[PDB]
């Protein structure tokens, strides 16, 4: 009697507790059903996967630099001195059933975490989702991205490895010891001594399994709490205003689709972990300070930093008995990047003077200057990231390595400018496309007029039509416009039988009539809600 059992359990919960009001309020919360709003969820989902994978890897990983010979199953690295951390990473890959799969999906989930954070940041920025309520959520979100990048760095830096070891040597050692006032002091505090200090990997393990994951979890909790209680913003639309949320309630629809999306994303991650090989550390010999490879790259989310260093024109300064190594620059540059990311919304509201409480997103085209700025920033990031690959790009795509370096050097100033101009003009052109759709309407097939040879596009008005043919022009309302008669009720009644065979004409007629009436009822409900809201 599952119904009786459920009723009894609910009565017990509501007698011990009194959450009916809260449960109902969270079950009725409305979340807009725009696809872009799922982007952030990806990161969260991927984050969860990382945790679930990370725990599994903590039961098999031994952080240390204790020198040991492998004496394991992997023949190509046998009798070779290496850290216990590398030995246990190899054992996970080979000696633990599914360990290679688990760590590959862990790395793929780290990459997806980074990429989805980056795409979510692109959405929030271009849509102005950070503009007044939610400016903090942008700051706490920008601090999540930085922590995620550093977390991934400490993660692939965790299994002491040739590639990851040289990455540590470059970034953590050189840049840290280049900082003028306290560079050497910071380096010695971090490594407890010189670069290969015997305390590095255990400390990175502590930072990467507990500390930084804990900070990220707390910040994600704050982020989701703010999104939940600062009702999620929405795009302009028919029934959508600054003072409401149009979408679906949590329980029946939003929760099921969010869970299904989590399942699909973890399926993608598992498929990648199986079919795609990520970080084959067994090929990456144990870290030796005298050994290095040509590739020598970090994960994509950090490559931009490396790219910066590659493209920065080897500028140093030599004060009285001291030197500021060129590496310092990237740190400063890094600071600037984060300094300009965390503190963007405030700069936007300082320049534009726009501190109003904005709950309606704005299309990227509707804000040409910010869209151009974001395109310019993305262009600079892509230039830096591909500069970090200039070795591989030159190898595969035959371009002289010096040519690639100088292309990046000139580009990091020119390409952002070209992209800004192009994106500004593109946003304005998209605005003009929308305006001309409103003025004239959608476009269709061409007709030759009866008396004369005039050819007319045979437009289709979206609103009231004037006494003559041309329609009253509609006023832009901040929402996408239909640029194809495709997407209206035109040529959209295929056979409902099956892919192979028909259904009886009566059943097809009933189904199509029901769907047609349902679309009318939806559109009508939106229209009456609009009219009641305004008037």
């Amino acid at each position: 009697d599952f119904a009786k059992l459920a009723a009894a359990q609910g009565d017990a919960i509501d007698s011990r507790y009194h959450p009916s009001a809260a449960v109902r309020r969270q079950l009725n919360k409305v979340f807009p059903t725009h696809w872009s709003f799922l982007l952030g969820e990806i990161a969260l989902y991927s984050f969860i996967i990382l945790l679930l994978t990370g725990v599994w890897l903590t039961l098999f990983f031994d952080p240390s630099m204790a020198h040991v010979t492998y004496d394991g199953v992997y023949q190509p690295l046998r009798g070779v001195q290496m850290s216990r951390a590398y030995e246990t990473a190899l054992d996970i890959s080979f000696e633990v059933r599914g360990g290679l799969f688990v760590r590959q999906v862990h790395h793929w989930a780290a990459l997806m975490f980074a990429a989805s954070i980056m795409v979510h940041l692109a959405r929030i920025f271009f849509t102005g989702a950070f503009r007044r309520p939610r400016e903090a959520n942008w700051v706490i979100g920008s601090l999540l991205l930085i922590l995620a990048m550093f977390e991934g760095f400490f993660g692939y830096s965790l299994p002491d490895d040739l590639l990851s070891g040289t990455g540590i040597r470059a970034a953590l050692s050189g840049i840290t010891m280049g900082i003028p006032v306290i560079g050497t002091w910071m380096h010695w505090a971090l490594f407890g001594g010189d670069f290969p200090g015997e305390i590095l990997i255990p400390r990175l393990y502590a930072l990467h399994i507990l500390l930084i994951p804990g900070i990220i979890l707390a910040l994600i909790g704050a982020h989701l709490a703010l999104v939940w209680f600062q009702k999620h913003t929405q795009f302009p639309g028919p029934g959508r205003t600054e003072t409401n949320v149009v979408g679906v309630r949590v329980m029946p629809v939003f929760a099921v689709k969010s869970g299904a999306f989590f399942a699909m994303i973890t399926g993608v991650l598992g498929l990648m972990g199986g079919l795609l090989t990520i970080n084959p550390i067994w090929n990456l010999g144990p870290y030796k300070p005298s050994q290095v490879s040509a590739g020598s790259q970090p994960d994509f989310y950090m490559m931009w930093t490396d790219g910066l260093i590659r493209l920065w024109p080897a500028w140093e300064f030599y004060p009285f008995g001291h030197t500021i190594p060129q590496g310092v620059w990237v740190a400063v540059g890094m600071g600037l990047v984060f300094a300009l990311l965390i503190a963007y919304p405030f700069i936007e509201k300082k320049v534009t003077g726009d501190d109003a409480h904005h709950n309606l997103l704005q299309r990227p085209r509707d804000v040409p200057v910010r869209t151009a700025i974001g395109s310019m920033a993305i262009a600079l990031y892509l230039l830096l990231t591909f500069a970090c690959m200039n070795d591989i790009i030159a190898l595969k795509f035959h371009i002289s390595l010096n040519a690639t370096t100088w292309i990046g050097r000139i580009g990091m100033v020119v390409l952002p400018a070209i992209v800004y101009f192009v994106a500004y003009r593109w946003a304005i052109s998209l605005q003009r496309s929308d305006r001309e759709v409103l003025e004239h309407g959608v476009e269709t097939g061409i007709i030759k007029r009866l008396p004369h040879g005039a050819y007319v596009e045979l437009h289709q008005p979206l609103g009231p039509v004037d006494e003559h043919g041309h329609p009253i022009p509609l006023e832009y309302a901040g929402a996408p416009l239909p640029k194809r008669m495709n997407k209206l009720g035109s040529g959209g009644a295929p056979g409902t039988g099956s892919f192979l065979f028909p259904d009886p004409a009566v059943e097809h007629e009933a189904l199509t009539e029901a769907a047609h009436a349902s679309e009318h009822k939806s559109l009508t409900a939106l229209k009456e809600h609009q009219d009641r809201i305004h008037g």
Binding site: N28, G247, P252, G267, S290, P325, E507, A525, L526
Partner: protein
């Protein structure tokens, strides 16, 4: 405008749902079943399709269970029969697991998009400036807590509490951090001229006066005799060799006492050096630094492998162009001229190790790097 004390008894599920939406300000507009026409076989097709996706997820999960339980996993040495089976062990694990959960998710999405009724629920957003009653009550509560506590009248407690918290926090943060803070310039490494800080020394720093530091090649033998003496004829014209500061005391790696001196040499971040035999025809193109005009033993030039910019090894060597390339950030130093950076981020030349040959003809350092050999830091070039 009444809480429906007794009307709730006869209210239907729809009525109570609407009442809840009204309480929360959530209006469900256009909640309609996805299959208003009953008995249509399109509904049956859709239901079978959703169940098919779920069944595919389940079959894939069962396949994951079976393949994980019963499959030839385990590393198989190269060339051994059954290696192919291993090579697609993890691929099958991921394939089956991902396919199972992805198909379950697809079935759930299809159920949402085809059976769960479509709704356009609209909610009342009350963002910003809580009603003035709540703001006034909160402000009154906080101000009563502050002023009533009599603070800002007890200036002595006001100042003493702040001083106590400041002193305690200073001491506590100091206690946290002082464990980590280490002086980079504590003289720890012994040297012929007394103990020196780590960054001033490498494996080539003479621990004793007239110490014979051989440029030992790093033969990658598994554990025993990893470093071997080296002789000038070993490197031919246009050849590069990575060499290390091996001592007579640091014998082969058989003994437990050894095998750690050698491991220390190997792990010496600044220890590795690259010895390059400049082609004789190219010796007229060589340019020398101040104080390094004799660091080369004939046509043998020893330059630190550690790149002067961020300290990656500069391993790559290009003969017929004499360019030492660092792969981390693609910096080229000119080997003919003193190893000065002719391209890339690096701005300081690689430190040249003095070299010569002792009795028996073995190559041996003729001294230490006249400058520190790693990437530059604040306390450098003085």
């Amino acid at each position: 405008g009444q809480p429906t004390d007794a009307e709730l008894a006869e209210m239907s599920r729809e009525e109570l749902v609407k009442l809840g939406g009204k309480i929360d300000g959530v209006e469900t507009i256009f909640k309609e079943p996805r299959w208003p026409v009953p008995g249509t076989k399109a509904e049956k097709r859709t239901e079978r399709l959703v169940a098919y996706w779920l069944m595919l997820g389940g079959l894939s999960g069962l396949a994951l269970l079976l393949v994980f339980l019963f499959w030839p996993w385990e590393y198989q040495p190269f060339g051994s029969e059954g290696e192919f089976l291993y090579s697609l062990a993890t691929p099958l694990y991921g394939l089956t697991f991902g396919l199972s959960i992805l198909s379950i998710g697809i079935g759930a999405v299809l159920f949402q998009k085809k059976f769960i009724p479509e709704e356009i629920s609209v909610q009342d957003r009350h963002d910003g400036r809580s009603p003035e009653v709540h703001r006034k009550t909160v402000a009154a509560n906080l101000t009563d807590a502050l002023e009533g506590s009599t603070l800002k009248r007890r200036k002595v407690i006001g100042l003493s509490l702040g001083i106590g918290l400041g002193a305690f926090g200073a001491g506590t943060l100091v206690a946290f951090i002082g464990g980590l803070i280490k002086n980079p310039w504590k003289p720890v490494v012994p040297t012929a001229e007394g103990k020196k800080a780590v960054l001033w020394t490498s494996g080539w720093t003479p621990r004793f006066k007239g110490e014979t530091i051989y440029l030992a090649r790093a033969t990658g033998r598994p554990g025993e005799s990893p470093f071997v003496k080296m002789r000038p004829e070993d490197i031919d014209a246009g050849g590069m060799e990575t060499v290390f500061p091996w001592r007579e005391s640091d014998g082969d790696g058989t003994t437990v006492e050894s095998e750690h001196k050698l491991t220390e040499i190997a792990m010496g971040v600044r220890n590795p050096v690259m010895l390059i035999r400049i082609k004789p025809a190219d010796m007229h193109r060589v340019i020398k630094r101040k104080g390094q005009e004799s660091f080369n033993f004939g046509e043998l030039f020893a330059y630190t492998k550690v790149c002067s910019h961020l300290g990656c090894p500069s391993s790559l060597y290009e003969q017929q162009t004499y360019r030492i390339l660092c792969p981390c950030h693609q910096s080229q130093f000119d080997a003919l001229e003193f190893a000065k950076p002719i391209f890339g981020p690096a701005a300081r030349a690689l430190a040249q190790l003095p070299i010569t040959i002792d009795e028996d003809g073995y190559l041996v350092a003729n001294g230490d790097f006249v400058e520190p050999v790693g990437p530059a830091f604040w306390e450098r070039k003085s």
